[PDB]
Design an enzyme around this catalytic site. Structure first.
Site, short mmCIF file in Angstrom:
data_model
loop_
_atom_site.label_atom_id
_atom_site.label_comp_id
_atom_site.label_asym_id
_atom_site.label_seq_id
_atom_site.Cartn_x
_atom_site.Cartn_y
_atom_site.Cartn_z
N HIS A 21 1.72 4.33 -2.94
CA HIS A 21 1.74 5.77 -2.72
C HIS A 21 3.09 6.28 -3.23
O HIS A 21 3.16 7.29 -3.92
CB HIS A 21 1.64 6.12 -1.23
CG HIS A 21 0.27 6.00 -0.65
ND1 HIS A 21 -0.83 6.67 -1.18
CD2 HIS A 21 -0.18 5.38 0.46
CE1 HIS A 21 -1.88 6.46 -0.41
NE2 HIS A 21 -1.51 5.68 0.60
N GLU A 25 -6.02 8.16 -1.23
CA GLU A 25 -6.18 6.91 -0.50
C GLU A 25 -7.17 5.97 -1.19
O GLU A 25 -6.94 4.76 -1.28
CB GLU A 25 -6.66 7.17 0.94
CG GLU A 25 -5.63 7.82 1.85
CD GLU A 25 -4.40 6.95 2.11
OE1 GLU A 25 -4.40 5.75 1.75
OE2 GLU A 25 -3.42 7.47 2.69
N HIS A 54 0.86 -1.19 0.00
CA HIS A 54 0.00 0.00 0.00
C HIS A 54 0.90 1.24 0.00
O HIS A 54 0.71 2.16 -0.79
CB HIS A 54 -0.89 -0.02 1.25
CG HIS A 54 -1.76 1.20 1.41
ND1 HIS A 54 -3.09 1.21 1.07
CD2 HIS A 54 -1.49 2.42 1.92
CE1 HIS A 54 -3.61 2.39 1.36
NE2 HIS A 54 -2.66 3.15 1.88
N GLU A 55 1.89 1.26 0.89
CA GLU A 55 2.78 2.40 0.94
C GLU A 55 3.64 2.51 -0.32
O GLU A 55 3.92 3.61 -0.79
CB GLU A 55 3.68 2.33 2.18
CG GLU A 55 2.93 2.47 3.50
CD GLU A 55 1.99 3.67 3.54
OE1 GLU A 55 2.36 4.75 3.02
OE2 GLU A 55 0.89 3.54 4.11
#
Ligand SMILES: [Zn+2]
Lengths: 422, 4
Positions: free
Chosen positions: A226, A261, A222-223
């Site tokens: 980003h 997000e 997930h990070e």
């Protein structure tokens, strides 16, 4: 393997891939021992008291002044053994991610996502932006500047506040102008989060104790997603949010969730970004890429002697997938832009990684955390690159039994319950 | 970021 060296925290520094370094935090700091696990990617097994000088205190404020979803422990990651385990855990997660076709694609995109050389004040020259570098102490004690794309570092005061951090620019918004910037991901492989198997329970702040544990590889991915957005300078401005109207508990508190997000989670969540606004962003970033193409055209000289001008131009031609005509002029092709933009925003999503890892995970970003657990993924008897917690040929192989904290209780220690604290 |  993604990481060709099985580093030990106590391995002697060599000033190359094991060295003491300093980061461009516009402040002073003692060198910290870091490890280069792959081209352009470093790991710093330290709590992050560096990227933000105002966040140097790890000690927990008074008990009557702590928020809801947070966990403090000023002693975490302060010993050599912990740092050794941190390094090995982060490494194993990169391997787990890289073992999937999607993870290999994402990691390849990240490595190719070198932050743009737009630090020059003279448009006829290309210069690197120093905050996209780290200063490495060489064997002779001198410092050498090294460009990097990603740094995985321990969390700051709030241990469970994982996030991407990067150094800004006086005028340029590097993560939103197509340029990109070095990403520092505050993350820990030593803790994970509990969620609930029933949607009506997981999205309710008053129910559930957190029966299932999130696979930490998904959290890191997930990070990394980003990071990918930020490295290509296409992150959506945090002021662009979704005024949640699909969850009464969010609504009653007027909770808003950024489009960045929702995009990152993917799945049905991404649909909360209407077509009009989505098209607005696409056009915006398309133009940003056009500026990069033109800036490269005006570049007649390069600053420094580490790389040649033609080399760096080719580096960014590949990163942004630009086109080159007869004269050698660069331009952005709509089809190629759309393909890359789509890859970074729709192909690389949390929901898609769940499909590749074959794990149980929150079905939406719009839920409520239940608890935080202490874990240890380093021992192969606990977690593997191939199966995570759901070890093949054991009682944990099926039905996500490995992620079931009640069945696989020996692998989880609940540190705090969040339910009811909202 | 993880979120709520
Ligand atoms: Zn996030």
């Amino acid at each position: 393997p993604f990481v060709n060296k099985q580093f030990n925290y106590k391995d002697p520094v060599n000033g190359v891939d094991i060295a003491y370094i300093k980061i461009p935090n516009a402040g002073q700091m003692q060198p910290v021992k870091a490890f280069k696990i792959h081209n352009k990617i470093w790991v710093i097994p330290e709590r992050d008291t560096f990227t933000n000088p105002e966040e140097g205190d790890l000690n927990p404020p008074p008990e009557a002044k702590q928020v809801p979803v947070s966990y403090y422990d000023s002693t975490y990651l302060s010993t050599d053994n912990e740092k050794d385990n941190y390094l090995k855990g982060v490494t194993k997660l990169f391997e787990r991610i890289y073992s999937t076709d999607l993870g290999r694609m994402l990691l390849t995109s990240i490595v190719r996502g070198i932050p743009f050389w737009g630090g020059s004040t003279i448009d006829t020259e290309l210069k690197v932006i120093d905050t996209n570098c780290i200063n490495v102490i060489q064997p002779d004690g001198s410092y050498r500047s090294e460009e990097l794309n990603l740094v995985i570092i321990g969390p700051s005061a709030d241990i469970i506040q994982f996030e991407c951090k990067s150094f800004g620019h006086e005028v340029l918004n590097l993560t939103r102008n197509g340029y990109g910037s070095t990403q520092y991901i505050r993350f820990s492989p030593d803790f994970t989060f509990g969620f609930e198997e029933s949607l009506e329970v997981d999205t309710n702040p008053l129910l559930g104790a957190g029966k299932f544990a999130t696979d930490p590889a998904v959290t890191l991915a997930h990070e990394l997603i980003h990071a990918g957005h930020r490295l290509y300078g296409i992150a959506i401005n945090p002021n662009r949010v979704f005024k949640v109207n699909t969850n009464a508990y969010y609504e009653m508190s007027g909770l808003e969730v950024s489009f960045e997000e929702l995009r990152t989670f993917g799945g049905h969540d991404a649909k909360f970004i209407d077509s009009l606004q989505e098209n607005e962003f696409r056009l915006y970033y398309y133009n940003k890429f056009k500026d990069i193409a033109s800036t490269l055209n005006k570049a007649k000289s390069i600053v420094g002697t580490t790389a040649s001008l033609q080399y760096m131009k080719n580096v960014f031609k590949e990163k942004y997938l630009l086109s080159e005509d007869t004269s050698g002029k660069f331009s952005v092709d709509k089809l190629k832009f759309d393909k890359l933009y789509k890859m970074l925003t729709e192909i690389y999503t949390e929901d898609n990684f769940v499909k590749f890892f074959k794990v149980l995970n929150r079905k939406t970003y719009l839920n409520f955390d239940k608890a935080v657990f202490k874990i240890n993924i380093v021992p192969k008897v606990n977690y593997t690159i191939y199966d995570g917690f759901n070890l093949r040929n054991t009682n944990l192989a099926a039905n996500f039994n490995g992620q079931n904290t009640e069945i696989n209780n020996m692998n989880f220690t609940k540190l705090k319950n969040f339910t009811g604290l909202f | 970021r993880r979120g709520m």
